[PDB]
Amino acid sequence: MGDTRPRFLWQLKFECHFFNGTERVRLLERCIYNQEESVRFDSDVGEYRAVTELGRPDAEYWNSQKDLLEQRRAAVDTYCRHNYGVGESFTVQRRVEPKVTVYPSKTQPLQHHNLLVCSVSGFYPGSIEVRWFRNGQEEKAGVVSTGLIQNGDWTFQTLVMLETVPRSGEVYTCQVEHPSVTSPLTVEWRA
Amino acid sequence: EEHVIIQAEFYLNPDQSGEFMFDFDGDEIFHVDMAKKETVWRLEEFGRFASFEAQGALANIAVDKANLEIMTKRSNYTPITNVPPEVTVLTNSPVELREPNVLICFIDKFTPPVVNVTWLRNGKPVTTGVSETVFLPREDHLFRKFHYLPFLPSTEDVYDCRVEHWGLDEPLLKHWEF
C-alpha cells in the first residue's frame, strides 16, 4: 500500500485472570510500544514495574501517586470481579452443542477410502474430547487432527482423522464429550 | 476453570487509527466503533444482557494517542518492525454442493494492524455478503483478524483470499476449491 511511511503503535492491555470463579483474581496491566511491553502493573505486586528501560519514567511517576495505586489495587474488585459478574451468564456459562458428522476421505487419489474424518463444528466452549473407536475398541494409532480452530464468532471446530483400512461389516464410531452435553455424542460409520 | 477478560486498545500513527475492545478467552465481546461513537457487540444478544458506555472508551483513546506521541519521542522515533501475516482459508462446516456455507480467511500473527483483504471468485472481486472482525489481540502483541464470505459450494467456482500487508513482498493469495 504505496504509503510506506514508518508506523508507531501503542497498545494497552488490562487483563483480568480468574481462577475458580472469582475466588482468586489477578489483574495485569500492560503498556506496549510497537511490539515491546514497557511497563506493567500486577496486582500480586501492587506497584508498577518497568519491563524495559523506556518504561522507567512511567513506573516512577505512577508509583509516586499512592492515591492512584490504591485505585488500581482496588480494581481487582471494582473492575475484574465487577465485569465477571456482569458477563458471566453469556461468556463463562455459554454452551453451544457440537454438530458431529463423519465422512470418508483419502490420503491421496485411491480406489478406496483410507481416512475417516470426524468433523465437530459449531461448539462453545473450546474444551472438547474427540475419540475414534473400531467395533467398540478405542483406536489410538493413525490419528491426526487440525486441533482446535477458533471461528471468530464464538464457535470452534475441529477435524479428527483416522487413517485405516476398513473391512466390510466393521463399525467405526466418533465419540465426542463437551460440557454442553451430559452424555457422549456418537456417530457411527459402517464400511 | 481459568478464564481471562482483556480490555485491549491501540492507537497507530500516522494512520490515526484506534481500536478499543473487550476479549473473553480469545473471542470479542464488543468493540467501540470510532466513527459512530457506539458500542458494537460481537453477537447481538449480548446487548440484551449487558451495557457499555462508549464515552469512556473514547476518553481512553484520546489518552492513548497522547501517550503514543510521548513514547514515539522517548524512543527516539523508533518505528515498528513489520511482521507479515500467516493466512489460512477454511470453511464453517463440511462442504456439500449447493448447501450454504461460509468461507473464513483467517489472518494471524501480524503487525502493525493495517491489512488489505479481498475475496476473489474465479479471479474477480466479490463484495456480496462479506464481513470482517476488528483486530483481535495476541499474547505476543501481534494481531489476529477474520474475514467471511457466505457461499454456495459448486464445481464451477474457485476462491482466493488476497492479503496485502507491509511485511510481505507481494500479495498473498490463499486458494480454496471444492
Binding site: - | A50, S51, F52, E53, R74
Partner: peptide
C-alpha cells in the same frame, strides 16, 4: 440503558505530558 454495565479501566497519562 436498563442492563448492568461493563466497566472500563481508565488509561493513565505517561510521564512527560499535560492533556
Amino acid at each position: 440503558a436498563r442492563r448492568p454495565p461493563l466497566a472500563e479501566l481508565a488509561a493513565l497519562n505517561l510521564s512527560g505530558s499535560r492533556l
